[PDB]
């Protein structure tokens, strides 16, 4: 089991080394949409004979076959990539650190000090390799500024001044890795990404509204048929369309009088 565990860790490292050697994106090979061929010949349903309820079932069939092919294509890539990684792992040596465990001897008795030093290594693993240098205002500095502010009589807002100092310092917080400042490091926070998504959604959402507005201004009678029921009306031939709404649309199209 230890041999398999070491072999697994060796494979994880091999996957990392080969992925970094290719410098390929992380999610590129995990996102199945990258394997889908959007230039597919897209068979025309107008040729295949389909009835009122057949068109939605036919579309779901085409989608299922396309989705299954992309899944199989990702598996085909992963099968080849796994074969490449298993060979590279076989011809590789593993040199990994051992689990930090308390020192124990058959004749001895472990002490609390050794147990604590081992616990310290666990807490050291919780520390991220790269972390933000978020500045925490020291009490000695906080009060030193407040004392000077009160000296110039601004004691009424000296506390508020310390809040602006902390915010201004945090807005320019730097990133550090291994305790040293990483130069040229750029990052996008979750709040910025969510804001971009929010605006990006509003752009397309209002574009969708503008699209339908043009249709309903010229032809408001489309609102009598719900969007989810539209597909159940289609057929391969125009004469094959379900008459459930045919006569009603023609009448509403004449207007309110």
């Amino acid at each position: 089991k230890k041999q398999a565990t070491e072999n697994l860790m060796k494979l994880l490292q091999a996957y990392k080394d080969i992925g970094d050697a290719k410098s390929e994106p992380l999610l590129k090979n995990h996102n199945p949409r990258t394997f889908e061929d959007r230039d597919y010949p897209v068979p025309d349903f107008r040729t295949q004979n389909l009835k009122a309820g057949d068109v939605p079932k036919f579309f779901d069939t085409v989608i299922s076959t396309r989705a299954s092919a992309a899944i199989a294509s990702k598996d085909k890539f992963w099968a080849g990539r796994k074969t490449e990684a298993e060979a590279a792992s076989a011809k590789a040596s593993a040199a990994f650190p051992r689990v930090a465990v308390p020192e124990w001897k058959k004749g001895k008795t472990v002490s609390i000090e050794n147990l604590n030093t081992v616990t310290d290594k666990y807490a050291a693993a919780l520390v991220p390799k790269r972390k933000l240098a978020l500045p925490v205002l020291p009490e000695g500095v906080k009060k030193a500024v407040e004392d000077f502010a009160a000296s110039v009589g601004q004691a009424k807002n000296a506390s508020e001044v310390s809040e602006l100092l902390a915010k201004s310092l945090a807005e320019k917080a730097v990133v550090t890795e291994g305790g040293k400042v990483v130069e040229g490091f750029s990052y996008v926070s979750k709040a910025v990404a969510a804001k971009v998504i929010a605006t990006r959604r509003a752009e397309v959402h209002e574009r969708l509204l503008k699209l339908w507005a043009k249709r309903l201004l010229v032809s408001p009678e489309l609102a009598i048929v719900p969007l989810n029921e539209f597909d159940a009306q289609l057929a391969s031939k125009f004469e094959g369309i379900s008459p459930k709404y045919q006569e009603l649309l023609s009448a509403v199209a004449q207007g309110n009088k």
Partner: protein, 154 residues
């Protein structure tokens, strides 16, 4: 349009809830897209639960996930909230160490809380894996791009 009168992220409902009503409006329960949309909403609900359980230690049980889901907290804001309860957390850790069954357990809880008290020790995936966080962002924008392409072609 019904439920679609507002954007996917501009509703008072949770994201998993808005997806459910949109799927029911766009497609019928028998369609393939309907099943995929309901499964998607369940995954969003799973992410919402994990998101809640990470913040319930600061804001209590009533985290109001919808507020955090619509507008995530800035790192600067997260720092000030960490310091807001820093005193109560240090005192709570002290009573937790006093309630420890052994001196070793008291040392562990104090050492554990010491790491979590440092705001720089807060793990930010955007810093550890920047190329991943940007990919997670463009993952959403690519899905939005697909809808835009359909509108642009129409």
């Amino acid at each position: 349009l019904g439920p679609q009168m507002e954007a996917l992220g501009a509703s008072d409902l949770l994201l998993s809830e808005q997806i459910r009503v949109i799927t029911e409006h766009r497609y019928t329960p028998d369609r393939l897209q309907y099943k995929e949309g309901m499964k998607l909403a369940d995954k969003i609900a799973a992410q919402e639960a994990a998101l809640k359980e990470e913040l319930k230690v600061i804001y209590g049980d009533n985290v109001d996930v919808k507020h955090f889901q619509a507008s995530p907290r800035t790192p600067v804001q997260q720092l000030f909230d960490s310091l807001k309860n820093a005193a109560a957390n240090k005192e709570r850790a002290a009573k937790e160490a006093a309630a420890a069954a052994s001196p070793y357990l008291a040392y562990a809880v104090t050492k554990k809380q010491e790491v979590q008290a440092d705001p720089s020790n807060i793990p930010f995936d955007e810093v550890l894996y920047p190329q991943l966080s940007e990919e997670l962002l463009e993952l959403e924008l690519s899905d939005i791009r697909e809808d835009e392409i359909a509108l642009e072609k129409a």
